[PDB]
């Protein structure tokens, strides 16, 4: 790792992150076919950024670029997955060069799989949603069919920035809105002793502990009710997607206006 050499080390670290894709996917039982597709995409983009003649390298929410490629891979293959779904996966040897690497570059390369950024980067480069949204909605199917019809009409009618996922998510909202055992201190002591001595990270264990704590207590009338339910849904949707309110409400308003114009 050096000027040129630093750039090379950063690229090697990013390739190792692709390994994370290998590890996550295999743990999955998806299509090994998957590896094949993932391998083509990495070759197209990375080489090109490199291709524009030894000027400037590149930087990214490095974690998000790999995720976008993984997400992109799924879009072609027709796996049913969503950006929000990808976020859930993220929650739950190494070359020296990596140790010896530009500070900034090393930080960018980082680890681990603002609301606006994840959605924006992917953009720059129906059946699937049905199950999840229905479940959140809790509708047996009547809701599903109508939303399906509405969205199709809206496309045809073309009321309709934001990605189709955003539009579709928005329109669902509109339609539904109006439906007419323990180590103990011992471990601490040992750690302290080792630090006295030269010593040289996150693990699941953490996840399990959190889950256990949560389980153990750890963590106009009709019209009015309908409105409240719908609102709950908006808030909760944002959180689950691992996306914001400012970016959802605006999109929904725009879609509704377009639909009204088309109908009129």
């Amino acid at each position: 790792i050096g000027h040129e050499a630093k750039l090379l080390f950063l690229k090697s670290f990013q390739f190792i992150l692709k390994r994370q894709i290998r590890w996550l996917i295999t743990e999955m039982r998806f299509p090994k076919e998957f590896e094949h597709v993932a391998k083509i995409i990495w070759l197209k983009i990375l080489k090109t950024i490199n291709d524009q003649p030894q000027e400037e390298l590149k930087l990214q929410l490095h974690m998000t670029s790999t995720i976008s490629i993984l997400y992109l891979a799924s879009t072609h293959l027709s796996l049913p997955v969503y950006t929000c779904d990808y976020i859930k996966w993220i929650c739950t040897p190494k070359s020296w060069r990596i140790q010896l690497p530009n500070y900034y570059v090393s930080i960018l390369e980082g680890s681990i799989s603002l609301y606006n950024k994840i959605a924006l980067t992917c953009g720059m480069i129906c059946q699937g949603l049905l199950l999840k949204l229905v479940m959140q909605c809790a509708l047996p199917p009547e809701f599903y069919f109508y939303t399906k019809q509405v969205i199709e009409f809206e496309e045809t009618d073309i009321r309709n920035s934001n990605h189709a996922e955003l539009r579709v998510l928005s329109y669902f909202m509109l339609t539904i809105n109006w439906m007419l055992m323990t180590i103990d201190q011992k471990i601490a002591r040992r750690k302290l002793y080792k630090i006295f001595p030269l010593d040289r990270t996150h693990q699941l264990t953490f996840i399990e502990d959190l889950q256990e704590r949560y389980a153990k207590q750890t963590p106009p009338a009709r019209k009015e009710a309908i409105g409240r339910l719908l609102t709950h849904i908006a808030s909760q949707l944002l959180v689950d997607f691992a996306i914001s309110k400012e970016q959802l409400k605006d999109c929904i308003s725009r879609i509704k206006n377009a639909c009204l114009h088309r109908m009129n």
């Binding site: 199950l131 229905v134 479940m135 509708l139 047996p140 199917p141």
Partner: peptide, 9 residues
Amino acid sequence: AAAAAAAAA
């Protein structure tokens, strides 16, 4: 009911 059906499937 829908959920049940899905499960069955």
